[model samples]
Every structure is written in structure tokens, then in C-alpha cells.
Target chain A: SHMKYTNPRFYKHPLFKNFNVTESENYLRSSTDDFLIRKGSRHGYCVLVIKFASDVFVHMKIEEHSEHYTCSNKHFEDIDEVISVYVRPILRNLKSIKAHAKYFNSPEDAEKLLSSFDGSKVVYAFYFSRKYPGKLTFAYNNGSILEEYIGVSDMLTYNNSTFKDIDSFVAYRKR
Target chain B: SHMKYTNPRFYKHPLFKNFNVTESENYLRSSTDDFLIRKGSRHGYCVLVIKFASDVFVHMKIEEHSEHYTCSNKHFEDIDEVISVYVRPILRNLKSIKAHAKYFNSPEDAEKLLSSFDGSKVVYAFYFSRKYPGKLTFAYNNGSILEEYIGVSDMLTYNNSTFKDIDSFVAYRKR
Candidate 1:
């Protein structure tokens, strides 16, 4: 239903996937794959779906607050420029360095974690390597995604290996 | 001044040319030429300045009605997507048909110029070939632009090309 997401009055770029449609995946799959970007489909919230090649899809939920579109984690008033700044370069040369994490309430929360870094540095942090559909995936700044995991034990294998538990890294790092 | 357009509190894509900076033109010139789009720099209202290759530029003013970003004339909540569907595809496989006109006012006025045509066709309407800053454009779908010219007598040279001395096409076409 159109009521499920973006109201009709809110103008969208023609490539944006309508929350009301089921045709996007295939449409993207068959597309020429140039700027084939679209809106993320968890629906009810504003998310961008960037077609990575003809097969990869980058769906990042962009935070909208008080007429501002937040990207690279700052308040933004113009959406078209956001695409130029975030969606364009990232899609053109997307290089993500993925990592794992066990917790983060949301991407918005994780993005605050990126305020001091280069907006182009992308990472994929997964919270759960053990379960499907049980994972919390968060994307930010260009095309970074944090794949949320189910246990700190699973990721504790590498990050801060000298620490005894997952909470040790949190104490010194992710604050 | 940053206040000329986006505020510092507002976040933008890294590729977004800062209202505070002038490095974009050259940065874009040296780039690999992928996703090299930027914001328009007449610098007051929000405008998208798309780098067309290393030399050409497409600067279109997107209307922000309330919190919405307009593309293809619809109100959209996400800016990343406007790029996905528009900047991506058009840049990759671009095509435009040109026409002439002397006046129609703005692109918003021109976009309503798109209601019934194909969304994939594009047209570059030069309002005044006699003037340096008077070309209007778009390409995609079955889109075409209505060009304007000077003097009813100058325009009258080509058939019914003669328009109202004051406000001709609008008197006939604008509703």
C-alpha cells in the first residue's frame, strides 16, 4: 500500500523504488546498471538502494530529521546533492572493509561512531554469523554496512584478541 | 558563504562541493570520471551540478517543497535515490534531443513541461542561443523540451513560430 511508505506528494527521483512496488529487484537486476539506485525496501522509513553493478544492491537507511537528510552523518537540506555526494562516488568506486559486531541499536547510532573519520571509509559490521534473518545490518557514509551478530564470542576471535571478552573492546574502542 | 546554501550542520556526501570550498571543479576534473556530480554553485538556492564528462556540466535546480526533494516532478523523501535513477543511468547511457525557446520561466515550470511524455526521453531547450546563460535541459524517457526565442518577428520567421510580444507560449500553453 502507498500508505506503507512515501506519500505520493513527496516527490521522488524516477529511479527511486516505490515502497508500493514489488518490481524493483527484477527491474534492477535487468537494468543497464549505471546509476540504477533505488530506495531501501524495509519500508516505512527512508532508505536508499543502490544497484551495485547488476547484482549488488546497497540499501542504506538515510535519517531524515526536521527537513534535513542526514548523510555522511550531518544534517542536509538538499537530496539531489546528497546523491551526488554519497550515492555517486561510492557506487563508482565502492570498496568496503567489513568487520563484525555484536551490538548497536541502529545505524543512526553507529553513524555517530563515524563522525570523526573520513566519510568515504566504508565497513560492514555483522552482529551475527550464526543466524539468518536474525542479523542486524546497518549501512552508513557512502556504502559501509555493519552486519550485526548474535554473540560477542563469535567476533572476539579477531578484534582485540588479547582481551578476555567482547566487552573489553567496547570499553576502549567503540564508545 | 556556507549560508549561501547548505549550513554546516547539514551533512552532505563527500563528493558534494561544499558551499565553503572551491576545490570541486578541479577535483572533478582530475577524478576517474565516475559519479563526478556536484551541487550547482550560483550558490543561493539548492541546485544539483552534474559533471558531464570532464568538461560538461548539468546544473538543475531541484525544488524542495517542505521536506520533500523533487525529481521527475514527484515529492521524494530520499536524495540518494534521485541519483540512483537519474544520475546513474543518464550518465552511463545518456542521450538528449535539443530544441529552442526564449522563455518558460524555470525548470519547475519546465518539468511540469514533462507530465504526459516519456520519462526516459530528454530534451535541451535553449531559451536564447543569442545569450550565454540561457539553455534549459533534460534527457530520458520520451521527454522533449519546448524552446523559446526572441521577438515575435524573429520567431515568426519559421511558420507559426511568431509568439505573443509579451507572453506568448504561456498564453497558449501554460495552464
Candidate 2:
């Protein structure tokens, strides 16, 4: 599982400067309450810091509220297995996230946080909201900035998480 | 196979005014020389028309050249079986093909010819040479326009197409 993210591309990414895998995994556990859905945030939320370029990192936040899913009883549950198995690996694979970000508010906030840093370094941020009924938004900065959205159904799923959606942009940017 | 593109969304596309499945398939064969790699332009090519929203139709052009592959002998071979069994169904499933007029010399030429518009509208488009080595692109214009790429690695496979890489989009527009 860890083998996937250990590619030369990840090693070559700018975000890797401080990205000790063990440290990051430890950081993930430390922030579990705030980042994972289990402890802190009422509904569920997690932030992922990924190395996208030689110097770029993507700060992706995934949020799931109680109402994101429509069960027979309208009760939604947070699955930790879903987080570790599905969401975590996806966060670690971030050379880039494929969707646009201009359409929403949350990713915009993430971009603001990314811009607080120095130089051309930027964060490709996203907010995946299951409450939006499985919607994903991407935010980033170029000479000008923009956002894009992808309906979860249109995205590819991995271990129950739609990680494949990010694959689109990785390919597009390479073009 | 043809059933994939026959969704209600496609029925509503402006490009489908006269879109008879049988006719389109025949059209696919007629232009097979110019568009297909075998008989005409040896590199590779094909166009897709997809419906998005109520009236928007995206004209997507796909192209491939021998240099895209890297073999010991660079002996690139055409996978017509790949196109028939793999690429066609995916194109038929498009929400739309998003592109502009200025990106390429070939797609533009295709569009000019399409402008003759005997009722059926066509767009000029091009698919790039890879690293995808085995990827297909899907572009579309929805309520808001966007481009999405899917990696066929996770998608189904047929014949010998091995449509392995589908990239995510970096450029999404709102129109």
C-alpha cells in the first residue's frame, strides 16, 4: 500500500521537503480528531497535505456531515475503515487533484491558507462534501485562480472513496 | 455497444438533431479513413459527439501517432480492435467533449469541414500523444462546462485496446 506513494514523483515533489512518511503518518494520527471524522468535528472532517509538484503541495479537506448520505432512516454513519483504507491512500497519492475549485466556498478557504505561504508555491486544495450529496470542489492559483466541481457519480471510486476523480487533472496537467 | 450513448442526456444534445445510431456508425465508417488510423492518416484519429445539458453538444476529436509508443523497435501498431471494442463505447457515454477552436492544426481543420453543417453539428478536436500511451479523454460542457479524464486502468477492458490511462482535467470552464 505504501509502495504506491513512494514513487520518484513523490520523492521529487516540493512538499516532500518536510514530508517524512512516518512523520506524516504520525501527524495524521495526531490530528485524527480534527482531521479524521471520528473525534473533533461533529460531522466528520480531515485535511490532507500532498506534494503535487517539485514545490507545490495540495491541502485537501474532506468533510462529511450527518446528512451527506440518505439512508432508509436518514441516519448517516462515519466509517473509520473508509477513512484509513479509502481516503488515506488517496490523500497520499496527490501529485494533483483533477477537479476545478472556482465553484465553491470551502476549497477557496483552503486556497487562502495555501497562499499564506511564500513564493510561487501553492496548494491545490479541495473540499469533498458527502452532504453536498457527494460533491467535490478543487481550488488552485495560477496567474489567475479558478475552481472546478465534479459530481461524485462522475468520479472514479477507490476502496469506496472516489479517488479516481483526481486522476483526471493529473493527466490534464501533464498535457 | 451503441446503447451506451443513447442516454436521455445525449438525446437532448444539439449535435444529435439527426443523430441516428445506425447513420452515425456508418458515418464513423465513412470518415474512418480520415479519422481512423488504418487507411488514411496512419497516426490515428476519431471524433466523438456527446450531449450535455439541454442543447449543448461537445465535439471531441481523438488522435494518436506512432511516436506515442516506446518499444525497442518503436514498432507502433494500430489497435483497431481497441477502438471498436474499447474507445467507441466510452465516447458514446460522454456528457460532452469540451474544447476551444485554437488548440490544434488538425482538430481545427476537422471543425472547418464540420461547419458545413448539413443539420448535424460537429466540433473540431484532437487527442494528444502520450505518455498516457494508453489513455482516452472525455470533454464536456454541462450546465457549467468542464473536462473530465478517466484512467481506463480502472475501467473495463476489451479486445486488446488496453485503454489504460485517462487523465483528469486541469481546465474547466463555466459558460
Q: Please report the candidate that would top TM-score against the real structure.
A: 1
Q: Model 1 chain A, poorest ten-residue lDDT window?
A: A151-160
- Deviating ranges (above 4 Å) for candidate 2: A1-105, A117-122, A129-132, A154-174, B1-175
Expressed as tens digits, the lDDT of each residue in A39-65 for candidate 2 is 212223333443322222334443333
lDDT of 1 by residue, A1-175 (tens): 2243445322465645554323554676676653443444543345555553333344555654445565534345556756776666554333221222433444445556645346655433323222232222333333443343321212232321222243443342342
DockQ of each: 0.01, 0.02
TM-score of chain B of 2: 0.20
Error of 2 at B146 (Å): 34
Task: Give me the displacement of residue A54 in model 1, in angstroms.
Answer: 45
Q: What would you estimate as the lDDT of candidate 1?
A: 0.41
